[PDB]
Amino acid sequence: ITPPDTPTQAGPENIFYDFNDGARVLLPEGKWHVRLLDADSENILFCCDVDKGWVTSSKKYFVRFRIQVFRQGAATPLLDETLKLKDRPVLISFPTGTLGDLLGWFPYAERFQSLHKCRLECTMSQDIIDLLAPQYPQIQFSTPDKPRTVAPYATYRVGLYFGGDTNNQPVDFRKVGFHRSAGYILGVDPREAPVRLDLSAPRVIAAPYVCIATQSTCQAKYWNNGTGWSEVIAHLKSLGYRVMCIDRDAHYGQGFVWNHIPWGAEDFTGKLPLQERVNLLRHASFFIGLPSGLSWLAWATRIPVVLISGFSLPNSEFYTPWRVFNSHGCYGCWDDTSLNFDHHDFLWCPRHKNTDRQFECTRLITGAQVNGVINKLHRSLTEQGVEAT
Amino acid sequence: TPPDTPTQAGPENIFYDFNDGARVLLPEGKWHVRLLDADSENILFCCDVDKGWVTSSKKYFVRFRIQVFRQGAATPLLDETLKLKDRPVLISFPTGTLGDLLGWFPYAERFQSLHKCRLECTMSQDIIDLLAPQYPQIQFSTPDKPRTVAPYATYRVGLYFGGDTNNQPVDFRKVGFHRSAGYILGVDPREAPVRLDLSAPRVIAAPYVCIATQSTCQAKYWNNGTGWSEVIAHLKSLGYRVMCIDRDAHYGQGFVWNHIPWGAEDFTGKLPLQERVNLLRHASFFIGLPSGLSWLAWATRIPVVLISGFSLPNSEFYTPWRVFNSHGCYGCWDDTSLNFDHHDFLWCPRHKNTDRQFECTRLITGAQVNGVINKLHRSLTEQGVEATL
Amino acid sequence: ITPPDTPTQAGPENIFYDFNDGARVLLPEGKWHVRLLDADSENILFCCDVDKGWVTSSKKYFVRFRIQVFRQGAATPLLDETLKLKDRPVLISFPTGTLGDLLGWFPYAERFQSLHKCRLECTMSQDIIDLLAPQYPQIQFSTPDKPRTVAPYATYRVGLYFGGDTNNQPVDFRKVGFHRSAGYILGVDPREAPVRLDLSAPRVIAAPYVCIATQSTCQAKYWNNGTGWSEVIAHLKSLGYRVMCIDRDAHYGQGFVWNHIPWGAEDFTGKLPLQERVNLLRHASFFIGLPSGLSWLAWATRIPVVLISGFSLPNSEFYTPWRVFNSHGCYGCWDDTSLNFDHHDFLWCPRHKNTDRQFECTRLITGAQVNGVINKLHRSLTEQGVEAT
Ligand SMILES: [Fe+3]
Ligand SMILES: [Fe+3]
Ligand SMILES: [Fe+3]
């Protein structure tokens, strides 16, 4: 996933400059004074004297950089080029991060291209490509190992950067929301939007039904209330809905802590292509889930989404009137800039790990609370149209 | 200031309330009290009190359920659940600045439409004159002359510092100072402009732009030496007349004073806000700071160029013309590890009394602002007023 | 700044002596006894036995020195030379200091020449040369880098010496006044006088007008009263005067502290030749300024000068009945021998930096105070003239 070993642009004096991984310039032997500017503000971002080697901007997100190379003590610069992306090869590289990450990030990539009118290629796992590519003919999708461009003018690496990093992102993603961070990185309208999907599939299950997602990547994201899911599933049926579980896994966990597809839900679990999930989701009356990926997919299918989460604040994901949250105990571990997410600890709870208050984030969210929300949504579905937002 | 005695009204002598945030007062002799959240059915607080006031630690909106038990009895004496329909409710704002109130107010209207209550709001006369005509369903008064006298519930909308989570559900710095009001009242947290009287006819014939350069602390000022002057000169070169509409022409502390910029026309002074609304309405656009006039300008439906470095772009209302620089210190105001000082006009927690003081806004050059002005100007001439907003 | 590397006058046995940088004698290879005397008092200033190398007076200001060199055992001296400046090449070197410095010092250089009847060359920036040279045909003007007399008999470097230095100046300039110090250095009548200017230019602006200078070299010299300038400018107009600001810069400052041409003053700013400023000043009814340079120029064009200053005492600059000063708080940072001016700190206030009281020097000088003195000046002008003394 590395940038070219040598910058892709030819400077007048055997000098190569690049905007892959930020503004780069490789100097041949000589005497130089190099300047990086922000073209929009005219500010001098960085400035130094060197003989040969590398000069790279500390900022890696989108900046309209302007590179200037001077012979020490000269009046005009030998090289003076400003980033201009129109009709030029650009690479946006996503990591093979979770599903929710990409569905959140991706629209911002399309915005970047409409704005700059560049030749854009994006890199991600094949399964997302199969899901999205047809709806974005403007953009070329590839895999990290076989990108078509080979030599690009500019590259941007959209992802999450922890520990408050402000070199790869303009603002800490925790301040703006993990998905909106993509917009800031790329310098586009940061307002959230759903991906475009193939919503042409015809209805298969005739009766009214609801989809649910109970599994996630860490325990904190689970709804850790003892009887929550069982109370919800029972209630959904008492309203006349069939209930299907569409989690990738039927059992998931670590050590002795294991989570299983709830008794009473239908087994639509399994790892299959996302398009099949889209097709099933499309005709669901609504969806109940966690802040992991499937909720973003449900969102993009244009159906109501009941989102249950205590470890993140309501503004941490896309807006839904059906968001569930409880503010009486610990909440928002995830958005707190004084704490640090541990990728390796599935049982991560910064403030209460190994105490009887562990995962209070979600234990305070009762089935009654979730059913209350479901009742309002149900009334709105009967009494008002589906169209009623 | 809640009533000295709860305004209910419970069948036995003791009176219960929701004015501070609930409240029960019990005559001498033992009882056991239970506070619940009707939505989740969780027991929030539980105790035995022989005498005195028992009140919830949470003061923001919750569907409280008060239960009073005789010791060791199985059934409760009192079991009242908050129901606001057709009842006197008081929303008390502080006499804070303009921007605060304009930002918060729409949430109070939402609270009313949701609960169908009899709502009275308390605020400075100044704002009442501006808003009252457009919110006929709500009663407006001043803090010293409230008409309700006896209210069923009271809610105190404001900013609470130091990470307080008793008067607000979530630290306002995590959600935005204005959106906090929606969380306190428990309604749709999405920002909206207030409704104004936009009937006034055009007075100044030629195209013009309004600007606001003053603010409440030095950090909210545009501390770039030549910023304003470069902008004002540029505006004129595009054919715009420029008017300054700040309440004061000179404002500051100690030796630090800010003045209406040379070259701007003098429309300053403490006028009724409606006159500012009338002038603003026909301005091609507005340039200001995260202070109050920007919120007024917003609500008059004209494009707003908003310059701010101490505040992240997300925090105020959205505008595609937000100016922000991410290369140095930024966001003093949103940072939960720091603390705003009301008494220090020269507040800069990270760089006070150093070379970098107010870097927040010194990095924002006139060129940067003129770049944004140029795009907005282009969009106004190319497209219409429709197509921008 | 540099004196010849070898003294310009030849003594008998290969000794070179001169007075360029104090009294100097370069001795080659012998056992010598050297005495420096003050011919006026006959005092032996310095006395020593030296084998080879340099012997210079510690005193560098004007002294009628008498150099005597002895063989170690000798009854009488082989060098008996005593300073005599008649018809001899003398160099007076000014630093490239501010305008007020030079205009204050210069008259004393002319006095030194009238007194001693020598051939005098002066070194200073070109812009001052253009202003003065025509009125001082007796004196030869040059710039520091291109001096015409490469072998001078005596040299004197007029300037400010800090830290109570008494080797380059007879007495601390803070005790006698920065401008008068020049006369002490040169040993002439120390009484202040204005420079001779070309006052022949004809009137251009017909109506009555006042010139003002609001900018300066450090913040302490600004009139840091919040509403001062604005109140003065408004008042001048109500008296029928047009007001022009003639500062070199329209904006000046450092960090976040910036000063701008006051709203309401006509813009006559910019880096123009001083002769254009003299021509404009000449016909002004009067001038209002700070202890910086333009006030000295105003003075010399023979118009009444209102001088506002708190960081220096009234006697610190030239006499004017229109000097404005406030004695109730901190004043006179500048004249205080126990403090030290900081050339590198634009926000220097030794007593009160970084406190509420910073620049109390001039916050105590209100617009009312200045308008009071303007009123008196105005009455005297309408009634008596011009001639006003
Ligand atoms: Fe937690
Ligand atoms: Fe700051
Ligand atoms: Fe002082």
Author numbering:
A (entry chain I), C (entry chain K): 10 to 398
B (entry chain G): 11 to 399
Pull text from the paper.
A subfamily of autotransporters, including AIDA-I (adhesin involved in diffuse adherence) from diffusely adhering E. coli (DAEC) 2787 and TibA from enterotoxigenic E. coli (ETEC) H10407, are glycosylated in their passenger domains, which functions in bacterial autoaggregation and adhesion to host cells. TibC catalyzes TibA/AIDA-I heptosylation and confers AIDA-I-mediated bacterial adhesion to host cells. Here we determine the crystal structures of TibC heptosyltransferase, both alone and in complex with ADP-D-glycero-β-D-manno-heptose (ADP-D,D-heptose). All the 12 TibC protomers adopt an identical structure containing an N-terminal β-barrel domain, a core catalytic domain, a β-hairpin thumb, and an iron-finger motif which are arranged into a palm-like shape.
A number of point mutations designed to reduce the surface entropy were screened and a TibC variant with three mutated epitopes (E83A/E84A, K400A/K401A, and Q215A/E216A) produced the highest quality crystal. This mutant exhibited identical biochemical and biological functions to wild-type TibC. Strikingly, one asymmetric unit in the solved structure contains 12 TibC molecules, which are assembled into a large ring structure. The overall shape of the dodecamer ring resembles a circular garland with an external diameter of 145 Å and a height of 72 Å. The inner surface of the stem is decorated with uniformly distributed 12 ferric ions, forming a characteristic iron belt along the ring. Six symmetric TibC protomers project upwards from the central plate while the other six project downwards, generating a gear-like shape at both sides. Two adjacent TibC protomers projecting oppositely contact each other in a back-to-back manner around a dyad axis; six back-to-back dimers are further linked together in a hand-in-hand fashion around a sixfold axis to form the garland-like ring. The β-hairpin thumb mediates the hand-in-hand contact between adjacent dimers. Within the module, a ferric ion is tetrahedrally coordinated by four conserved cysteine residues (Cys-339, 342, 358, and 370 in TibC), analogous to the zinc-finger motif. Thus, the iron finger is required for maintaining structural integrity of the TibC dodecamer.
